[PDB]
Amino acid sequence: TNIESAPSLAPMKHYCDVTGLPAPYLDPKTRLRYHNKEIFAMIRNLPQGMGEQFLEARGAHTV
């Protein structure tokens, strides 16, 4: 009766919000997950509206 959806309890893997490659790192400032220093450089250089789009592509938002 639309009570057929199911949550999950397993710990989820971490992927880079930009390249989708695995992400060891979560940026404390913009909260984007990122693969390496090259992508961290881009992420900190993004246009101010773009950071919220990378979050929103995985349904996340900063506020």
Partner: protein, 66 residues
């Protein structure tokens, strides 16, 4: 009756972002294996094992001296 902790399964590798833990892949073969090993000992090995507690039976051996 021998057993060993090989590690923590890497399915849990993101249970935290840092933990003092060693994460290993799940075993990819059969969970059960049977293999036959022709073990060799000697009568001296039986002497030594029976003369005194050996290995992990005698931890105070770490003191040396007596």
């Amino acid at each position: 009756g021998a057993c060993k902790r090989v590690g923590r399964s890497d399915a849990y590798a993101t249970e935290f972002d840092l933990e003092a833990e060693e994460y290993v892949p799940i075993p990819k073969g059969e969970v059960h294996k049977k293999k036959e090993i022709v073990q060799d000992v000697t009568l001296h090995d039986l002497d030594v094992a029976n003369a005194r507690p050996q290995g992990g039976q005698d931890i105070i051996s770490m003191m040396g001296q007596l």
